[PDB]
Amino acid sequence: GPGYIDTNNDGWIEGDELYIDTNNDGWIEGDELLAMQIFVKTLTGKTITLEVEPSDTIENVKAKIQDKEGIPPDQQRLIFAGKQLEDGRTLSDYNIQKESTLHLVLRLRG
Ligand SMILES: [Tb+3]
Ligand SMILES: [Tb+3]
């Protein structure tokens, strides 16, 4: 859902002219201007890309991981730069930014 818009109107497409089209219509609407991409290195799989925003909470992110990889949020733990990412937290208050990368840890059960 990423893509590009020539906002400086210079005829070309630059690095700052990436925008993430959240709603996957052909467009970029005002509310998708903060959307960004972050990666998650899954445990047993590959590195996976998410379309999140800085205001999103961790439960959100996990919600997204489930949708994508089929793991339940209670079974997920997420790690960034050594810190256990806790619930009810924006990922801007952890200082997670465009193209940051997260660690999936999975609980035992058995
Ligand atoms: Tb341009
Ligand atoms: Tb759109």
XYZ file of N, CA, C and O and ligand atoms in Angstrom:
442
model
N 0.810 -1.258 0.000
C 0.000 0.000 0.000
C 0.821 1.276 0.000
O 0.243 2.352 0.106
N 2.172 1.172 -0.122
C 2.993 2.377 -0.232
C 2.927 2.939 -1.639
O 2.160 2.431 -2.474
N 3.718 3.982 -1.901
C 3.641 4.676 -3.175
C 4.013 6.135 -3.047
O 4.312 6.621 -1.960
N 3.953 6.835 -4.170
C 4.615 8.113 -4.296
C 3.780 9.203 -4.963
O 3.046 8.937 -5.938
N 3.958 10.429 -4.450
C 3.301 11.639 -4.964
C 4.283 12.819 -5.088
O 5.019 13.145 -4.141
N 4.294 13.447 -6.268
C 5.278 14.499 -6.592
C 4.840 15.827 -5.981
O 4.294 16.706 -6.644
N 5.095 15.960 -4.691
C 4.547 17.064 -3.946
C 5.338 18.349 -4.192
O 4.740 19.431 -4.210
N 6.657 18.253 -4.403
C 7.449 19.455 -4.761
C 7.168 19.885 -6.198
O 7.581 20.969 -6.619
N 6.446 19.032 -6.934
C 5.984 19.339 -8.288
C 7.138 19.543 -9.258
O 7.002 20.261 -10.259
N 8.271 18.900 -8.969
C 9.481 19.073 -9.771
C 9.544 18.112 -10.973
O 10.524 18.114 -11.709
N 8.483 17.329 -11.181
C 8.414 16.347 -12.274
C 8.921 14.947 -11.925
O 8.740 13.994 -12.699
N 9.565 14.825 -10.764
C 10.235 13.603 -10.384
C 9.710 13.163 -9.044
O 8.952 13.876 -8.400
N 10.136 11.978 -8.630
C 9.743 11.396 -7.352
C 10.951 11.196 -6.450
O 11.878 10.489 -6.804
N 10.912 11.792 -5.264
C 12.052 11.787 -4.364
C 11.806 10.855 -3.174
O 10.787 10.157 -3.118
N 12.758 10.819 -2.243
C 12.647 9.974 -1.046
C 11.588 10.449 -0.058
O 10.975 9.640 0.648
N 11.370 11.765 -0.027
C 10.365 12.387 0.851
C 8.967 12.376 0.240
O 8.025 12.924 0.815
N 8.827 11.747 -0.920
C 7.547 11.723 -1.617
C 6.959 10.319 -1.558
O 6.086 9.959 -2.346
N 7.454 9.536 -0.602
C 6.793 8.299 -0.209
C 5.679 8.633 0.786
O 5.855 9.440 1.716
N 4.525 8.022 0.544
C 3.396 8.090 1.434
C 2.798 6.708 1.434
O 2.822 6.015 0.414
N 2.245 6.319 2.577
C 1.632 5.018 2.705
C 0.150 5.196 2.600
O -0.436 5.923 3.390
N -0.421 4.542 1.590
C -1.853 4.515 1.365
C -2.494 3.399 2.156
O -2.751 2.299 1.667
N -2.708 3.735 3.411
C -3.489 2.990 4.367
C -4.714 2.250 3.819
O -4.769 1.023 3.899
N -5.684 2.998 3.283
C -6.992 2.449 2.888
C -6.926 1.749 1.512
O -7.924 1.262 0.968
N -5.717 1.708 0.969
C -5.439 1.079 -0.314
C -6.351 1.488 -1.500
O -6.401 0.790 -2.510
N -7.049 2.624 -1.400
C -7.641 3.245 -2.591
C -6.474 3.788 -3.438
O -5.303 3.652 -3.070
N -6.750 4.397 -4.575
C -5.636 4.887 -5.366
C -5.003 6.156 -4.803
O -4.066 6.703 -5.402
N -5.497 6.629 -3.658
C -5.217 7.992 -3.247
C -4.503 8.086 -1.936
O -4.311 7.098 -1.240
N -4.087 9.306 -1.629
C -3.591 9.656 -0.308
C -4.521 10.699 0.278
O -4.680 11.782 -0.262
N -5.144 10.367 1.389
C -6.077 11.277 2.007
C -5.365 11.974 3.187
O -4.281 11.557 3.595
N -5.919 13.061 3.709
C -5.238 13.810 4.793
C -4.809 12.960 5.994
O -3.726 13.151 6.559
N -5.653 12.002 6.369
C -5.397 11.127 7.511
C -4.349 10.026 7.269
O -4.011 9.278 8.192
N -3.839 9.884 6.048
C -2.797 8.868 5.823
C -1.383 9.467 5.722
O -0.426 8.767 5.362
N -1.234 10.735 6.104
C 0.054 11.419 5.935
C 1.033 11.089 7.043
O 2.229 11.323 6.906
N 0.540 10.530 8.138
C 1.452 10.122 9.210
C 1.783 8.618 9.191
O 2.711 8.166 9.900
N 1.024 7.857 8.386
C 1.206 6.418 8.282
C 2.640 6.174 7.881
O 3.200 6.917 7.068
N 3.231 5.136 8.467
C 4.617 4.755 8.196
C 4.773 3.240 8.186
O 3.871 2.496 8.589
N 5.938 2.797 7.723
C 6.256 1.379 7.652
C 7.268 1.010 8.717
O 8.247 1.717 8.914
N 7.023 -0.098 9.403
C 8.000 -0.647 10.318
C 8.085 -2.135 10.018
O 7.166 -2.689 9.417
N 9.195 -2.760 10.418
C 9.404 -4.183 10.204
C 9.298 -4.934 11.487
O 9.604 -4.423 12.547
N 8.878 -6.176 11.368
C 8.981 -7.111 12.453
C 9.771 -8.328 11.987
O 9.402 -8.976 11.000
N 10.865 -8.637 12.675
C 11.528 -9.908 12.427
C 10.766 -10.987 13.182
O 10.788 -11.020 14.411
N 10.070 -11.857 12.468
C 9.362 -12.920 13.149
C 10.378 -13.927 13.636
O 11.526 -13.921 13.228
N 9.937 -14.817 14.496
C 10.835 -15.744 15.130
C 11.285 -16.794 14.138
O 12.462 -16.939 13.865
N 10.321 -17.511 13.584
C 10.599 -18.654 12.730
C 10.369 -18.353 11.272
O 10.622 -19.204 10.433
N 9.859 -17.162 10.971
C 9.524 -16.798 9.587
C 10.488 -15.804 8.960
O 11.715 -15.897 9.123
N 9.924 -14.841 8.244
C 10.728 -13.813 7.588
C 10.476 -12.459 8.247
O 9.672 -12.347 9.168
N 11.181 -11.434 7.796
C 10.892 -10.102 8.280
C 9.671 -9.571 7.531
O 9.549 -9.702 6.325
N 8.761 -8.983 8.289
C 7.425 -8.675 7.837
C 7.233 -7.176 7.951
O 7.788 -6.562 8.856
N 6.480 -6.575 7.026
C 6.277 -5.116 7.031
C 4.853 -4.740 7.401
O 3.897 -5.318 6.892
N 4.747 -3.742 8.279
C 3.473 -3.225 8.768
C 3.249 -1.747 8.433
O 4.176 -0.954 8.450
N 2.002 -1.384 8.158
C 1.616 0.003 7.962
C 0.945 0.452 9.240
O -0.200 0.104 9.502
N 1.679 1.227 10.028
C 1.245 1.670 11.336
C 1.258 3.186 11.352
O 1.662 3.811 10.368
N 0.809 3.775 12.461
C 1.095 5.176 12.743
C 1.553 5.377 14.133
O 1.212 4.602 15.013
N 2.253 6.493 14.349
C 2.977 6.770 15.570
C 2.058 6.720 16.779
O 2.484 6.338 17.856
N 0.797 7.081 16.583
C -0.184 7.049 17.658
C -0.673 5.645 18.008
O -1.411 5.484 18.984
N -0.310 4.636 17.217
C -0.845 3.279 17.434
C -0.289 2.648 18.702
O 0.855 2.884 19.087
N -1.113 1.844 19.353
C -0.695 1.154 20.556
C -0.099 -0.206 20.218
O -0.212 -0.701 19.104
N 0.536 -0.826 21.189
C 1.127 -2.117 20.938
C 0.084 -3.179 20.639
O 0.338 -4.044 19.823
N -1.083 -3.109 21.281
C -2.145 -4.102 21.070
C -2.561 -4.073 19.635
O -2.960 -5.083 19.066
N -2.529 -2.862 19.093
C -2.739 -2.610 17.681
C -1.781 -3.390 16.817
O -2.166 -4.133 15.920
N -0.508 -3.187 17.094
C 0.536 -3.780 16.299
C 0.374 -5.296 16.291
O 0.463 -5.938 15.240
N 0.105 -5.851 17.469
C -0.079 -7.288 17.622
C -1.304 -7.751 16.850
O -1.294 -8.818 16.220
N -2.356 -6.941 16.920
C -3.567 -7.185 16.162
C -3.166 -7.346 14.703
O -3.605 -8.268 14.023
N -2.299 -6.454 14.243
C -1.862 -6.457 12.857
C -1.051 -7.695 12.538
O -1.169 -8.243 11.457
N -0.214 -8.115 13.481
C 0.656 -9.272 13.288
C -0.203 -10.534 13.147
O 0.047 -11.368 12.272
N -1.216 -10.672 14.006
C -2.149 -11.794 13.914
C -2.798 -11.892 12.538
O -2.771 -12.934 11.884
N -3.401 -10.788 12.120
C -4.041 -10.708 10.823
C -3.085 -11.207 9.737
O -3.469 -11.912 8.816
N -1.823 -10.862 9.873
C -0.871 -11.154 8.841
C -0.290 -12.547 8.998
O -0.146 -13.245 8.010
N 0.036 -12.966 10.221
C 0.791 -14.224 10.411
C 0.068 -15.320 11.165
O 0.581 -16.421 11.286
N -1.104 -15.008 11.698
C -1.927 -16.003 12.362
C -1.508 -16.344 13.775
O -1.758 -17.451 14.243
N -0.884 -15.397 14.467
C -0.512 -15.587 15.865
C -1.384 -14.709 16.739
O -1.569 -13.544 16.426
N -1.947 -15.263 17.823
C -2.697 -14.459 18.798
C -1.830 -13.547 19.692
O -0.776 -13.975 20.169
N -2.283 -12.297 19.917
C -1.612 -11.251 20.705
C -1.137 -11.653 22.114
O -0.111 -11.145 22.610
N -1.890 -12.537 22.755
C -1.539 -13.074 24.074
C -0.298 -13.975 23.980
O 0.433 -14.138 24.950
N -0.084 -14.556 22.797
C 1.060 -15.431 22.515
C 2.265 -14.646 22.028
O 3.356 -15.184 21.930
N 2.043 -13.372 21.722
C 3.078 -12.482 21.224
C 3.696 -11.604 22.308
O 3.005 -11.080 23.188
N 5.008 -11.436 22.212
C 5.722 -10.392 22.936
C 6.589 -9.631 21.932
O 7.153 -10.218 21.014
N 6.682 -8.322 22.077
C 7.391 -7.545 21.090
C 8.544 -6.814 21.719
O 8.401 -6.199 22.764
N 9.691 -6.871 21.057
C 10.902 -6.267 21.586
C 11.544 -5.295 20.622
O 11.689 -5.578 19.447
N 11.911 -4.136 21.158
C 12.612 -3.092 20.414
C 13.792 -2.558 21.221
O 13.636 -2.118 22.380
N 14.968 -2.595 20.589
C 16.173 -2.023 21.164
C 16.324 -2.530 22.591
O 16.747 -1.793 23.468
N 15.950 -3.789 22.817
C 16.076 -4.420 24.137
C 14.904 -4.274 25.098
O 14.878 -4.941 26.128
N 13.937 -3.414 24.773
C 12.803 -3.166 25.673
C 11.559 -3.933 25.266
O 11.133 -3.930 24.116
N 10.994 -4.584 26.260
C 9.702 -5.207 26.199
C 8.659 -4.138 25.980
O 8.475 -3.268 26.829
N 7.974 -4.179 24.848
C 7.003 -3.140 24.546
C 5.689 -3.475 25.233
O 5.098 -4.519 24.985
N 5.265 -2.582 26.122
C 4.085 -2.799 26.957
C 2.795 -2.260 26.329
O 2.803 -1.451 25.396
N 1.677 -2.709 26.885
C 0.365 -2.378 26.352
C -0.129 -0.993 26.798
O 0.350 -0.421 27.795
N -1.099 -0.482 26.038
C -1.559 0.889 26.162
C -0.429 1.868 25.899
O -0.277 2.854 26.614
N 0.382 1.602 24.879
C 1.454 2.529 24.550
C 1.573 2.803 23.075
O 1.619 1.900 22.249
N 1.581 4.091 22.780
C 1.859 4.615 21.474
C 3.263 4.151 21.104
O 4.103 3.966 21.972
N 3.542 3.947 19.829
C 4.908 3.609 19.479
C 5.764 4.840 19.182
O 6.889 4.727 18.707
N 5.236 6.018 19.483
C 6.034 7.224 19.431
C 6.598 7.535 20.807
O 7.533 8.327 20.926
N 6.046 6.919 21.849
C 6.559 7.175 23.197
C 7.682 6.178 23.566
O 8.592 6.518 24.334
N 7.619 4.965 23.007
C 8.840 4.243 22.637
C 9.230 5.006 21.397
O 8.344 5.543 20.726
N 10.506 5.110 21.062
C 10.824 6.027 19.968
C 10.933 5.341 18.627
O 11.975 5.376 17.983
N 9.823 4.739 18.208
C 9.788 3.900 17.028
C 9.438 4.772 15.856
O 8.484 5.549 15.903
N 10.233 4.633 14.807
C 10.170 5.523 13.669
C 10.175 4.724 12.375
O 10.365 3.515 12.383
N 9.944 5.420 11.272
C 9.964 4.824 9.962
C 11.070 3.792 9.886
O 12.208 4.046 10.264
N 10.710 2.612 9.410
C 11.657 1.518 9.153
C 12.371 0.908 10.378
O 13.274 0.075 10.240
N 11.932 1.277 11.573
C 12.373 0.580 12.770
C 12.050 -0.888 12.643
O 11.185 -1.281 11.871
N 12.740 -1.695 13.434
C 12.604 -3.122 13.346
C 12.356 -3.721 14.737
O 13.022 -3.361 15.719
N 11.379 -4.622 14.807
C 10.948 -5.206 16.069
C 11.165 -6.690 16.123
O 11.106 -7.401 15.114
N 11.384 -7.143 17.343
C 11.516 -8.542 17.652
C 10.351 -9.370 18.152
O 9.853 -9.113 19.250
N 9.916 -10.350 17.373
C 8.874 -11.229 17.852
C 9.462 -12.356 18.709
O 10.376 -13.076 18.308
N 8.932 -12.455 19.922
C 9.198 -13.533 20.855
C 7.843 -14.215 21.062
O 6.810 -13.557 21.120
N 7.836 -15.530 21.168
C 6.578 -16.258 21.291
C 6.508 -17.043 22.607
O 7.486 -17.646 23.055
N 5.347 -17.030 23.242
C 5.255 -17.671 24.530
C 5.201 -19.182 24.366
O 4.762 -19.705 23.345
N 5.651 -19.866 25.404
C 5.690 -21.316 25.427
C 4.417 -22.160 25.311
O 4.305 -23.047 24.447
N 3.446 -21.800 26.165
C 2.234 -22.616 26.481
C 2.571 -23.994 27.067
O 2.121 -24.334 28.174
N 3.372 -24.758 26.306
C 3.767 -26.128 26.648
C 5.241 -26.367 26.408
O 5.835 -27.185 27.099
Tb 9.254 15.529 -6.837
Tb -5.851 6.403 0.477
